Paper text:
The S‐layer of the bacterium, a layer of protein found of the surface of cells, has received a significant amount of attention over the past two decades as a potential target to combat the growing threat presented by C. difficile infections. The S‐layer contains a wide range of proteins, each of which possesses three cell wall‐binding domains, while many also possess a “functional” region. Cwp19 has a TIM barrel fold and appears to possess a high degree of substrate selectivity. The protein also exhibits peptidoglycan hydrolase activity, an order of magnitude slower than that of lysozyme and is the first member of glycoside hydrolase‐like family 10 to be characterised.
Here, we present the high resolution structure of the functional region of one such protein, Cwp19 along with preliminary functional characterisation of the predicted glycoside hydrolase.
Residue numbers in the entry: 30 to 387
The structure:
């Protein structure tokens, strides 16, 4: 059946939970949200279980997420994840656990204030500062193993249907990994080595998942441009930021090597936008997966509703037009909507999705 997913982001309490330190209210906020999503045809919840090197689940590896209580590491008095999963399943909805692999801190947060048992505190060798934030080093084999193991815990212990990574990889062109490169890089072009570091993580996460539960899917949602045609003649007829260059996310390699089961390019632009034309990009991405077994879903930017903050771009108003176009491409297998709150908070969006999905 067609994929009809919504992202439920927990970072900064974006979509869920609205309330901290109140188990009953958090539970009701979630079921009410699922009910509204189901009512418009959403069949899959993609829920951020690791927003910030943390866990919205009981873990022997990673600390409780601050977004449940206000305090990182604080036990909220229940494990939310069984509830999040079981309530999705009772409504006939699939559940994909979404992880951010490398993030550790937000801007200006002190690394020294993490909980004692935090992996980044126990393993200072793993941590790289970039600007005013800290990250796990994608180039360390121990870091990759730790991420694999962190996901494997969730696969083993919870009835998930999928594992999902979003679009954050290396945080910028530069990154203070010279020592890592010297030790492990074999003199390879450094940027190619960084791309391969990310590829290796994806490969190893997929393999781990399959060795436990073969039918659990693994997917990634990268940024919507891989390379512009101006950098690579087989790239897209677009301008602006490229995932290949800017975060070392080589989505084409992932597809060609079968490192993922599904891919969700974030096409958060209107049809006709010169720099990043939705209509050109759906075609480009459909062609990328042709002849592979990688499922293509389009990331839909319904959060853009004409605000000046987005230069007046209004994706929500044209969502029927976008999905109608998607459906012209047999390689496109559905959509993921950013984000759940936008569906919940808008009667117009609800009406449009009902008309697409009923
Ligand atoms: Cl290898």
């Amino acid at each position: 059946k067609e994929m009809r997913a919504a992202w439920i982001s927990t970072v900064y309490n974006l979509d869920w939970p609205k309330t901290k330190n109140n188990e009953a209210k958090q539970k009701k906020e979630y079921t009410d949200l699922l009910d509204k999503l189901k009512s418009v045809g959403i069949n899959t919840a993609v829920v951020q279980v690791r927003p910030k090197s943390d866990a919205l689940y009981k873990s022997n590896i990673n600390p409780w997420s601050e977004y449940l209580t206000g305090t990182q590491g604080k036990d909220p008095g229940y494990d939310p994840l069984p509830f999040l999963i079981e309530e999705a399943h009772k409504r006939g909805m699939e559940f994909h656990a979404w992880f951010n692999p490398y993030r550790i801190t937000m801007a200006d947060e002190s690394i020294d204030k993490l909980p004692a048992n935090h992996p980044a505190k126990k393993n200072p060798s793993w941590v790289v500062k970039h600007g005013n934030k800290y990250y796990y080093d994608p180039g360390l084999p121990e870091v990759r193993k730790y991420i694999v193991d962190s996901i494997a815990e969730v696969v083993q212990n919870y009835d998930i249907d999928g594992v999902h990574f979003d679009d954050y990889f290396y945080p910028g062109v530069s990154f203070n990994d010279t020592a890592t490169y010297q030790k492990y890089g074999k003199g390879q072009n450094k940027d190619n080595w960084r791309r391969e570091n990310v590829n290796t993580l994806l490969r190893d996460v997929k393999a781990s998942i399959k060795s436990i539960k073969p039918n659990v899917v693994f997917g990634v949602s990268p940024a919507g441009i891989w390379r512009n045609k101006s950098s690579d003649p087989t790239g897209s007829d677009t301008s602006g930021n490229e995932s290949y260059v800017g975060t070392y996310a080589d989505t084409r390699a992932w597809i060609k090597q079968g490192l993922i089961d599904y891919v969700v390019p974030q096409l958060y632009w209107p049809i006709g936008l010169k720099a990043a034309d939705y209509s050109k990009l759906v075609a480009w991405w459909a062609n990328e997966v042709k002849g592979t077994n990688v499922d293509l879903y389009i990331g839909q930017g319904i959060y853009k509703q004409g605000q000046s903050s987005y230069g007046g771009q209004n994706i929500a108003k044209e969502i029927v037009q976008q999905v109608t176009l998607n459906r012209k491409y047999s390689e496109i297998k559905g959509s993921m909507y950013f984000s759940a709150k936008d569906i919940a908070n808008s009667t117009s969006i609800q009406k449009d999705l009902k008309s697409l999905y009923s």
